[PDB]
Ligand binder design. Sequence first.
Ligand code: MG
Ligand code: MG
Ligand code: MG
Ligand code: MG
Ligand code: MG
Ligand code: MG
Ligand code: MG
Ligand code: MG
Ligand code: MG
Ligand code: MG
Ligand code: MG
Ligand code: ZN
Lengths: 190, 176, 199, 52
Amino acid sequence: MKTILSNQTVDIPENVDISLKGRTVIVKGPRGTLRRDFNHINVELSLLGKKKKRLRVDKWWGNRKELATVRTICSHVQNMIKGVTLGFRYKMRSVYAHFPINVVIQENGSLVEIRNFLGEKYIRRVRMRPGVACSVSQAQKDELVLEGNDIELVSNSAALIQQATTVKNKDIRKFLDGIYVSEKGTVQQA
Amino acid sequence: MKASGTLREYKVVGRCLPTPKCRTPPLYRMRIFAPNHVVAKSRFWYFVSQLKKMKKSSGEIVYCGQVFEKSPLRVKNFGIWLRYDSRSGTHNMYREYRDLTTAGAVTQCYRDMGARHRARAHSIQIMKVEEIAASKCRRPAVKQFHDSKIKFPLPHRVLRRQHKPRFTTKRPNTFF
Amino acid sequence: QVLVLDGRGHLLGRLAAIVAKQVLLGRKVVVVRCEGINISGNFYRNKLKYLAFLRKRMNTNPSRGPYHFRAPSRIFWRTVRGMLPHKTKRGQAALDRLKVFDGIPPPYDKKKRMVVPAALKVVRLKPTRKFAYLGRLAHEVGWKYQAVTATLEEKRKEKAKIHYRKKKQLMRLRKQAEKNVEKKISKFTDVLKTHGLLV
Amino acid sequence: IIEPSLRQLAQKYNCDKMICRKCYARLHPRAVNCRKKKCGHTNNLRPKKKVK
RNA sequence: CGAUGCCGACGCUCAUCAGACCCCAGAAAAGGUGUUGGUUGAUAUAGACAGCAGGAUGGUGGCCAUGGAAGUCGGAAUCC
RNA sequence: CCAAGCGUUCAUAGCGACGUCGCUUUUUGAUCCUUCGAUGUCGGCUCUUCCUAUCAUUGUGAAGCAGAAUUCACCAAGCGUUGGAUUGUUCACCCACUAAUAGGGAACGUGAGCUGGGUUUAGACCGUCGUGAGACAGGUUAGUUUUACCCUACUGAUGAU
Ligand SMILES: [Mg+2]
Ligand SMILES: [Mg+2]
Ligand SMILES: [Mg+2]
Ligand SMILES: [Mg+2]
Ligand SMILES: [Mg+2]
Ligand SMILES: [Mg+2]
Ligand SMILES: [Mg+2]
Ligand SMILES: [Mg+2]
Ligand SMILES: [Mg+2]
Ligand SMILES: [Mg+2]
Ligand SMILES: [Mg+2]
Ligand SMILES: [Zn+2]
C-alpha cells in the first residue's frame, strides 16, 4: 500500500557546509569536497533549518521498495559528512604461511605492487581509485593503510587489493593467504 | 452475477408461500448489492435457497426496493466480510474501504477482489457490511487517512490528453 | 509540409507506430537524431533481445536472410517497416516518405523540430523503470560511428548555443522596444488585448 | 607458521560462510535464503564445512 | 487493419525464458525474508522484537545398557 | 520432490529405500492418418551444418578438496573427440596413442554421390518339416545398382540499373 509520506533527517554539524543543486548533494568541510548525484531515486531533499543544521528527505506515495531508498540516501549523506570531517582509514593486514607477501607502493600511493604472493613470479599491480592513498604503516609487521574521503572509493580499492591476492585451484580453507581488510575506521579520531 | 457499472444497494424482503399448514409464513429481509432489481431478486433467491428450505417457485418476493444512502456527503469507513473461492478452497475475509456510499464501497470491494485475488463476481459472497468508526479500523491503508491536518503533493503529474497537441514543439512539464 | 521529429527521449515502438500512420497519410516525415530513442526494459534485456535477432540468419545462404542493420537510424527504419504493408506499392511508397538520420545532419540542424508527447519516455514510462538507449545498444551490438556522431553533435550544440544567445538578444531588444514605443503603440495594444492575443 | 588472530581474518572470509545445498552459492554466515535467482532464493542452507 | 487520437475507473505485476483470450497448438510435484492481500495465535510502557555480558550448575560422573559414554553415541525415565 | 537409511560420527560432501511428479522422441511398442498409375528399402565411405542432456579445453562455486589424483555443480556447444584386430553389421569387444577418445539429429541426413559385404527374385548345398509340390527373422555360395541437357539451390564467370 502506497504510504502518504515517509521522511528522514540527517543532522549536519556546524563544522560542515552542505548545499544541493536538486538531487546533487555537495558536502564541503575540513578534508575536501564530495558530491553524490541522487537523480535516480525520486525523493525530495530539503535543506531546512537556518544555517542548515539538518537535511530532510521525503518520499511521497512510495511503495515498499521505494521506501527503502530513504535511509540509503540518509546513510550516504552521513558517510560523506563522516568522510569529509574524519576520513576513511581501511587498515588491512597481510596473511601468509610461508612466502612473505612483499608489497610496495608506487606513484605516491596510487599503485600497489604485490610480489612473492604464494611464492609466485607474477607481480600483481593494482591501480588505486582516484582519491585513495595507500601506504605501508608501522607498528604492524605486514599491513597496509588505505585513506580517503569517499567510502565507496576506499572500500572498493580495498576490495581490489584483496581480490587481487586470491588462491587459485587450491583449498582456500588450508591455504589462508591474502591481504584482508582488518579494521575499518577514520583518519583522525572523534 | 456480473458487477456491471456501479452496484446499487437493494433491500429485498420475501416470504414462502401461504399453505393450509402455515397460514402465514415469516418474512425474510436481505441486503443485496447488484446492478439492478432483476439481479437483486435472483441473488435474494440464491441466498434464501442457500439458507432456508425455500425456492423461487415455493415462495414470493414481497418487496424489492433500493435503499439510498443516509449521508452520501460524509466520507465513511466501510468494513466488509467477504466469502469467496480460489482455485483451491474457499476463504472468509474482512476488507476495509473509505467511501461515501455503501454500494460504492461494495463496488470497490468487487474491483478489489478482482484485482488482488482474480475472483470473478460470482465467487464472492458479501455477508456483512458495516460502517466502522475511524478508531476501530485495522487496515493500515485505511488508517493512514485518519489525520485531521492531512497534506501531500501530487508529485508526478503525468501529461494526459497526449494526442490533442499530438505534434508539438515544446516538451511536456510534469511539475505543478 | 514536412515533419521533423526529434528522436530523443522517445520510445521506439510508440514513435514507430505514430510515424507509420502519418507516412501512410501521405505526410513526409523525417526522424532525426535516432540515437536518442530509448526502448523500455533494462539494457541487458534489450541487448539479449537484439542479439537473438542477430542469431536468425538463413542457414543455407546468410547473404539472403534477415538483414540486421546496426545503426540506430536503420533500426528505427526497420521497426517502422514492420508497421507498414511494405510488400505493396503503397507501403513501399509509404517507406519512401520516411527519412531517418543519426545526429542532426545540416539540412535539419537549422530547423525547429517537433515532439510527440504521446510517445516520450517521461510521459509513457513510470519513473522507476529502466530503459536502454538505442545509441549505446547499437554501439554494443556493432555500430561503429557512435564516437563520430558524438563529436559532430557537440560541435553542433556549441554552434546552436550562439544562435540561441543571438536570439535572446533579439528578444531583449524587442522587449525594450515594446517600452520605448509603448507611447505610440498604446492604441494598437488595447485592441490586441480586448481579444486575448496580448494578455 | 601463522598467528591465530590473523587466522581469524582469513577464516572470516574464506571458510566461515554458508552454502546453498541447491546451487552451491557462498553466502554470508547469517544467511537464511540464497541470493541467486537460479535456485529460487531457497531457504535450504548449510554451514561451510570446516577443514581438518 | 476498418474502430478508444476516451485528459475511461480501480488495483496487481519486472521476468539476464515476462505476459498476452473457447476448441488451441505446449507443462507438474515442490519451493521463494520477490511483492501484494487474507486467516489464526502469541507479547507490548508489570516497557517487547532486534543489537552489545554474566550464567546453564549441587544432587548427577542420574539410573540405565555397553569395552566406556558422565547435561551430548541408544531407550523408559524425566522428579528436587 | 519428501527423506528411512549409507556415509567411523552426520538424512541431503556424495548417494538414497518406500512412495510420488515430470521431460524427451537418438530404444522398442501402440495406432494406420499420407503414400501401392512406386518417395529406391541395412550399413560403411565422403561431406556439411545443428542440438546440449559437457568427455576434454576457458572462467568459476562445493567436497569425506593437505598436495597430486578425483567426484558434484554452474556460465558455456568456440574448438577438439583418433589409428587398428574380429564382424555385412548398427552394436559389441580388445590393442595403442591421447587432453579427451561424450551422446545425438537432419525422410532412423546422405544409391541420377559411391560401394553392394547383408537383407531380398530366378541357379544350387546341408539341416529340420511335409507322402508331395514346397516351407524355414536356420546356416552356405553365385547373382545387371539406369538418365540431368530442364527449374531452383550452391560454386565460380559475363553483365544489368
Ligand atoms: Mg588439487
Ligand atoms: Mg547413520
Ligand atoms: Mg506417387
Ligand atoms: Mg521415382
Ligand atoms: Mg526421390
Ligand atoms: Mg547446460
Ligand atoms: Mg536414411
Ligand atoms: Mg539422393
Ligand atoms: Mg543408384
Ligand atoms: Mg551380395
Ligand atoms: Mg535364391
Ligand atoms: Zn542458493
